Amino acid sequence: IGLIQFCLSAPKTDMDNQIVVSDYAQMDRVLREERAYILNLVKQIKKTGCNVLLIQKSILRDALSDLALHFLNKMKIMVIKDIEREDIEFICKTIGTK
Amino acid sequence: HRPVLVLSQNTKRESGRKVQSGNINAAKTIADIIRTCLGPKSMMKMLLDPMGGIVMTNDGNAILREIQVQHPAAKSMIEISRTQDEEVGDGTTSVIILAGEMLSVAEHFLEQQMHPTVVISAYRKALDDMISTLKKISIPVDISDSDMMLNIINSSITTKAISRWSSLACNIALDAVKMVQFEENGRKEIDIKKYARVEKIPGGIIEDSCVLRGVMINKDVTHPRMRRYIKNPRIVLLDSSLEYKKGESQTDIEITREEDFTRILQMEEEYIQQLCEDIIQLKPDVVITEKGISDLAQHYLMRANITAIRRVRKTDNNRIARACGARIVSRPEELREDDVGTGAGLLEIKKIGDEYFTFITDCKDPKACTILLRGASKEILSEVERNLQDAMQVCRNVLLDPQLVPGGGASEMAVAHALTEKSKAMTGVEQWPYRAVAQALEVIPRTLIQNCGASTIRLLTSLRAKHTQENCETWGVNGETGTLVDMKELGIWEPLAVKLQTYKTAVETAVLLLRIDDIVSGHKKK
Amino acid sequence: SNKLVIEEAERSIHDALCVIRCLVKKRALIAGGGAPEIELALRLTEYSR
Amino acid sequence: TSLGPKGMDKMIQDGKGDVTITNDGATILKQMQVLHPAARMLVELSKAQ
Amino acid sequence: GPLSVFGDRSTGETIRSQNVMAAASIANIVKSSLGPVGLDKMLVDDIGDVTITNDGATILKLLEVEHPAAKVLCELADLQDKEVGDGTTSVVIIAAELLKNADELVKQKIHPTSVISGYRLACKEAVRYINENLIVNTDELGRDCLINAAKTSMSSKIIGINGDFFANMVVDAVLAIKYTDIRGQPRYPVNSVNILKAHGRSQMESMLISGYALNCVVGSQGMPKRIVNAKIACLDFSLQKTKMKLGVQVVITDPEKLDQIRQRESDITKERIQKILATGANVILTTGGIDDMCLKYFVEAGAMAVRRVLKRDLKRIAKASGATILSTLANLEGEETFEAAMLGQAEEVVQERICDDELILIKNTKARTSASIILRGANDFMCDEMERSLHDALCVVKRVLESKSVVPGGGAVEAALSIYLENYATSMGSREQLAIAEFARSLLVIPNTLAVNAAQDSTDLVAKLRAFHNEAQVNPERKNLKWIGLDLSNGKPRDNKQAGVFEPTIVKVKSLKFATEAAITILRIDDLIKLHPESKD
């Protein structure tokens, strides 16, 4: 069992982000690289060897993208969503995660 | 002011015999509205519409559906009429009259210390015998005989106000139904709603009406220099526009050089020109679309001597797609020769009442049609439109279920006597309400002889007597003379499907309204 | 079975958990059933005399 | 009437429509909404317990 | 001087009396709809919507109540829906009578906790008695227990026909949806049976569909409306022109590139729709939508495409047809895959006409052979009640299959308790014998109410029933009179085992437990304080 606060979604910085598409093939490049980023995150999770994820509720960023959920389904990883900031101390002592 | 400790505050409750009999009285009130709209001697009812219009009709459903009630039981009888209007055609007036009588005889039994479950049980058993009898007295139909189908439909429009011009209504409906007998995959259907369109233009007389072998739309030419008459056009149907539109993005084009502003404008013009070239690769004569046509598109198509229609509705393009066999194409780059509606007939832009109409008619083998009505005013056109909409429905019933039952009351009498002969061996408490159903069936021939002003004593006694003999079993009411003539000579036959539905709905209507012992009113829902 | 019963059950559990807490804080008990009230009434009277 | 195992429970309905059944004196007093400034001291007393 | 709370204080006999009346006011409603001889209720709301039903839980949830003691009985019915499935009438009748008789005891200076203790003791003993006086499991009766149970429940509803037309559809629909699982759990998920309504033909022309009835239409009138030996593509993404994301902008400095970048918005879409068809898919089912551009490709390809269906419906189709739900693109850093091997099957997919409406049927499905039932009524009023009645019957049969034990109906179980419990009261009768006896006497409200609603003899018909159940217990000759109930159509006793009148054991074991506890809670509301409402602040 793992406890993740990292948002398994598209990359985003604290600064305002804008990506410019100024060519034909550039549009495909934006879509392809984003899919690779999210898949790479799931690959890290599977290589560690977890079975069940506890996902902490996020406000500003999507906690889990639809693409990431599909990838995690293929990895046979069970996901519990919407763990509150008030649940963390109790969960950590009970299960033993960090 | 201290409130009272109550439950269900500001509500009302009624229970007991006041409800058991009250609901029946409500059903009777509905039944009396259209009681005189059954036979061939009906009179017209003029209703003032809450929206400011006027509705003049003698159709049982068109009358009741516009009558608003407050009583929660009267609403049920109105819904029975609205339901029948969608399942069958002329199975309307006789269902409200019959259902009312079945409740009427129930009122007598509820006062005779009979449990509601005994009345309901017996009525359901009677239905099984009423339906069984109808299937035994049926008449086979050879639906390929043009004269049989003419005789059937001529009877079905006799009651309605269109009967004055029966020599026109019969042919209009019979042909329209045949044209929409369309089969593409392995399933036969007769569609008289999506492809049997009825259009009406005030002016002229009913003798000017016809069935159009094709379609018509209330549109003029896109451009005055386009052809207004084409003998045999190649018709292509489009879904897309012929304009330049922004894409679904946040497009921002940086204009920095003197040539950039006007170069963008040139590409906007070239884009429209290029896609307008794509839509003539099929060598069309007529291009019909649904969205705007740019000025450049109007110029280009004019130069190609192509006639265009600007803004046709999706339902109209779906209809012509079957008349001409064209496929609607949503991308000019994927046009195929197989998309062209070949076999089309004449294109003519006509002027009727200072308004232009586009006709595409005389098609080789259309699978869709339009009925064009003319008349003194919108009032007679509304009556004719409604009656033709019914005239097409009776054809579907026979074409899908080719069995008739003698009409004019002969069916209802034969079934009442079939119930009577079986009732002799009931030998139980249900024997009484079982016989009552047989008596309730009489309300139909009783109404028919009343509408013509004839005696209710001499005709009913004589008719009941004639059905005691095994020689004919098809004696009914002559609604024009006021006497009794066997149906083998009158020739008035009705679809089996309408008679089967009439009994099924009438009995179940009574079952619902006899089960209510309490009414509670005044609550809110979330 | 009912929300009213469940809410009262929550309170009943809390009280019982606190009774044990009291025994942990002060590892001594007395007889209930009115014992300290009768004993106080008698001995306090003798004090006041 | 809420002392001992032979006591009874109370129901209180507030001004919003939230109805509760309880025995615990602390949860009774919090819902009674006593106004008098002298008797309200009993509510603070129960908080200490 | 007085309590300084700004509300009202009422204690003692004032609230104790009001609590019983509030319970009786609700019981006075449901007592009239007990047994196969009950009659339907009509409820009308403020705006004019009319509802007709004989379901006790529907009626009570629709009727507004104020007193908190009446809300408890409304919740009590909701417990039966979750725990039992058909017991939504008698659970309130029993509970209200326990309150009435309990009031008569405590007014004699009997402490409320003496009555409560007796009620809990007698209730536990009553359950012990029932579990020792059962009839039979579902192995000796076979199908008979399933048709009998289905007809027993339906006898109280508008579809209570004497024949087996409905009973066969109920039992067969439940048996056709058997799913195995670990540790011997033969699941019957009756919630997967799709029930449809139509104001059309009579009750006797209802359809039993092998497969799934999908409440949608094909739409564009150029697609095939009948496909035989179909491959079904169940997916959950939209088929439309591809939009740019909010965080990505298209900023162009070379006008020559305007056409390629703009055009890509439609090309990237059509590349995908060709590949879900290149696998041989015949019926494409999406919970999203298909725009006018994309509809062309299904028509030209000769494919069926159904849009805007519910996610709960597509998941049931995919499981019944063996398809996997695909929402995106994947398969080991593949750009476009569409999982060609994950298509489902059906022998036939056809759109039919169901009395001036359109319905898509997916027949036989070849994986799980799910079920749907299309009900036919004369009007909307009948159709709504028929749906509820079918649901009840499906649930009762489920309970029979899960809990392989039946008890007699007709009041036989309550009559048996009305004798055993009275004798029990004489064994442990020190102080609670009044509460035990009243608990037992409260049970007779069921055979009493049944006789009244049937317009049959009251005090003589039920008394005769009790004589038969008495002899079975005071003359131990194995007379086997414990399975006798009332025949409300003749006014005579009958053997419910030979008559086939069976109810699941749990319908009565659970009702006694929940009805008793609900009354005990209400019997502890002697004091009530009500505060002034806050309306305008």
Q: Find the CATH number of the domain harbouring B362.
A: 3.50.7.10
Looking at residue B455, its amino acid is S
The three-point CA angle A12-A17-A23 to 5° equals: 110
Cα separation of E74 and E63, whole Å? Answer: 9
> Do residues E5 and E529 touch, judged by C-beta distance below 8 A?
yes
B209 is in an annotated binding site: no
Residue with tokens 């009285």: B25
- The residue of chain E nearest to residue C6, with distances taken between CA atoms, is E521
Beta strand B210-212 pairing with B369-375:
antiparallel
> Do residues B93 and B159 touch, judged by C-beta distance below 8 A?
no
DSSP symbol at E290: B
CB burial of residue E425 (10 Å; 0-12, 13-18, 19+): buried
Q: Choose the closest CB to A39 out of E249, E254, E333.
A: E333
* Coil vs helix vs strand at B279: coil
Smallest CA–CA distance, residue C25 to chain E, in Å, is 34
- Active-site residue flag, B59: yes
Cα separation of E445 and E458, whole Å? Answer: 11
Q: Which long-range contacts (CB under 8 A, 24 or more apart) does B465-474 make?
A: B467/B413, B467/B414, B467/B417, B468/B417, B473/B137, B473/B410, B473/B414, B474/B406, B474/B410, B474/B414
Catalytic residue, candidates E53, E58, E81, E89: E89
The three-point CA angle E24-E27-E31 to 5° equals: 140
Whether the CB of D3 is below 8 Å from some CB of chain E: the reply is: no
CA distance from start to end of chain B? 29
DSSP symbol at E490: T
> Do residues B224 and B272 touch, judged by C-beta distance below 8 A?
no
Instruction: Count Cβ atoms below 10 Å from residue B195 Cβ, excluding itself.
Output: 24
Which tokens in the block code for residue A66?
């639809």
> D9 vs E527: CB contact, 8 Å cut-off?
yes
Q: Choose the closest CB to D35 out of E6, E113, E530.
A: E6
Touching subunits of B (3+ CB pairs, under 8 Å) are: E
Q: Sheet of B369-375: strands edge to edge?
A: B196-202, B369-375, B210-212
Whether the CB of E14 is below 8 Å from some CB of chain D: the reply is: no
Q: Report the interhelical angle of E380-402 vs B74-87 (nearest 10°).
A: 90
Residue with tokens 């009291």: C22
Whether the CB of E525 is below 8 Å from some CB of chain D: the reply is: yes
CA distance from start to end of chain D? 19
Which tokens in the block code for residue B424?
């002799």
> Do residues A89 and A63 touch, judged by C-beta distance below 8 A?
no
* Coil vs helix vs strand at E279: coil
CA distance from start to end of chain A? 10
Cβ pairs C/D, distance under 8 A: 11
Residue E464 zone, left/alpha/beta (φ > 0; ψ -120 to 50; rest): alpha
Cα separation of E303 and B520, whole Å? Answer: 52
Which tokens in the block code for residue B445?
């021939």
- The residue of chain C nearest to residue D26, with distances taken between CA atoms, is C11
> Do residues E376 and E206 touch, judged by C-beta distance below 8 A?
yes
Whether the CB of D48 is below 8 Å from some CB of chain C: the reply is: no
Adjacent-strand bridge partners of B140: B403
CA E251 vs CA A11, B207, B213, E453: distances in Å? 21, 66, 54, 80
Looking at residue E27, its amino acid is A
Looking at residue E356, its amino acid is D
Nearest to B413 by CA among B452, B370, B460, B343: B460
A-facing residues of E in 191-250 (CB < 8 A) are 244, 247-250
Residues of C with CB under 8 A from a CB of E: 1-5
Q: Choose the closest CB to E533 out of D15, D21, D31.
A: D15
Which tokens in the block code for residue E194?
């799709």
Q: Report the interhelical angle of C3-25 vs E506-522 (nearest 10°).
A: 70
Cα separation of E261 and E276, whole Å? Answer: 24
Best of A39, A41, A70, A75 to mutate (most E CBs within 10 Å, chain E) = A70
What domain count does chain A have?
1
- Active-site residue flag, B92: yes
Cα separation of E117 and E123, whole Å? Answer: 10
DSSP symbol at E319: H
Cα separation of B143 and B149, whole Å? Answer: 7
Cα separation of B15 and B11, whole Å? Answer: 14
> Do residues B99 and B78 touch, judged by C-beta distance below 8 A?
no
Domain assignment of residue B359, given as a range: 215-372
E-facing residues of B in 279-338 (CB < 8 A) are 318, 321, 327-331, 334
Please spell the DSSP secondary structure of B356-391, one letter per residue. EEEEEE--SS-S-EEEEEEESSHHHHHHHHHHHHHH
Instruction: Count Cβ atoms below 10 Å from residue A70 Cβ, excluding itself.
Output: 19
Smallest CA–CA distance, residue E331 to chain A, in Å, is 9
Backbone torsions φ then ψ of B231, nearest 5 degrees: -65, -55
Catalytic residue, candidates B92, B307, B361, B505: B92
Residue with tokens 């690779």: A36
Cα separation of E22 and E20, whole Å? Answer: 5
Nearest to E508 by CA among E127, E38, E96: E127
Smallest CA–CA distance, residue E260 to chain B, in Å, is 12
- Active-site residue flag, B175: no
C34 is in an annotated binding site: no
Backbone torsions φ then ψ of E377, nearest 5 degrees: -135, 165
Does C touch B (3+ CB pairs < 8 Å)?
no
Torsion of CA B69, B74, B75, B80, to 10 degrees: -130
Residues present in chain D in total: 49
> Do residues E154 and E386 touch, judged by C-beta distance below 8 A?
no
Nearest to B406 by CA among B496, B274, B310: B496
Q: Which long-range contacts (CB under 8 A, 24 or more apart) does A68-73 make?
A: A68/A8, A68/A9, A68/A38, A68/A41, A68/A42, A70/E327, A70/E328, A70/E330, A71/A38, A71/A39, A71/A42, A71/E330, A72/A8, A72/A42, A72/A45
Domain assignment of residue A89, given as a range: 1-98
> E200 vs B83: CB contact, 8 Å cut-off?
yes
Smallest CA–CA distance, residue D2 to chain E, in Å, is 10
Catalytic residue, candidates E53, E88, E152, E505: E88
Cα separation of A41 and A45, whole Å? Answer: 7
CB burial of residue B396 (10 Å; 0-12, 13-18, 19+): buried
Q: Sheet of B307-309: strands edge to edge?
A: B307-309, B286-288, B235-238, B328-329
Q: Report the interhelical angle of B74-87 vs B93-110 (nearest 10°).
A: 140
Residue with tokens 């392989």: E404
Cβ-Cβ contacts under 8 Å for E457 (sequence gap 6 or more): E451, E491
> Do residues B393 and B229 touch, judged by C-beta distance below 8 A?
no
Nearest to A37 by CA among A19, A56, A58, A59: A19
> Do residues E468 and E90 touch, judged by C-beta distance below 8 A?
no
Residue with tokens 């603070």: D44
Q: Report the interhelical angle of E433-442 vs E90-106 (nearest 10°).
A: 150
Residue with tokens 């009530």: E528
Whether the CB of E527 is below 8 Å from some CB of chain D: the reply is: yes
> Do residues B445 and B484 touch, judged by C-beta distance below 8 A?
no
Whether the CB of C37 is below 8 Å from some CB of chain D: the reply is: no
> Do residues B69 and E48 touch, judged by C-beta distance below 8 A?
no
Smallest CA–CA distance, residue E253 to chain B, in Å, is 5
Looking at residue B495, its amino acid is P
Which tokens in the block code for residue B39?
């036979």
Adjacent-strand bridge partners of E371: E210
Cα separation of A46 and B504, whole Å? Answer: 65
Which tokens in the block code for residue A26?
């550039």
Please spell the DSSP secondary structure of E493-510, one letter per residue. EEEHHHHT-EEETHHHHH
Residue by residue, what is the 3-state secondary structure of E419-444?
HHHHHHCCCCCCCCHHHHHHHHHHCC
- The residue of chain D nearest to residue C8, with distances taken between CA atoms, is D22
Q: From the CA atom positions of chain E, what is the Rg in Å? A: 30
Please spell the DSSP secondary structure of B90-141, one letter per residue. S-SHHHHHHHHHHHHHHHHHHTTT--HHHHHHHHHHHHHHHHHHHHHS-EE-
Q: How many CA atoms lie within 13 A of E455 on its CB side?
A: 7
Q: Which is it for the CA torsion B206, B211, B217, B220, positive or negative?
A: negative
Cα separation of E209 and B205, whole Å? Answer: 52
Beta strand E406-408 pairing with E502-504:
antiparallel
Beta strand D10-13 pairing with D19-22:
antiparallel
* Coil vs helix vs strand at B18: helix
Which tokens in the block code for residue B209?
């009406």
DSSP symbol at B78: H
> Do residues D40 and D20 touch, judged by C-beta distance below 8 A?
no
Please spell the DSSP secondary structure of E321-387, one letter per residue. HT---B-S--SSS-SS---GGG-EEEEEEEEEESSSSEEEEEE--SSS--EEEEEEESSHHHHHHHH
Cα separation of B38 and B34, whole Å? Answer: 8
Residues present in chain A in total: 98
> Do residues E33 and E39 touch, judged by C-beta distance below 8 A?
yes
CA B408 vs CA A92, B119, B239, B485, E171: distances in Å? 86, 29, 52, 10, 45
CATH number of the domain encompassing residue A84: 3.50.7.10
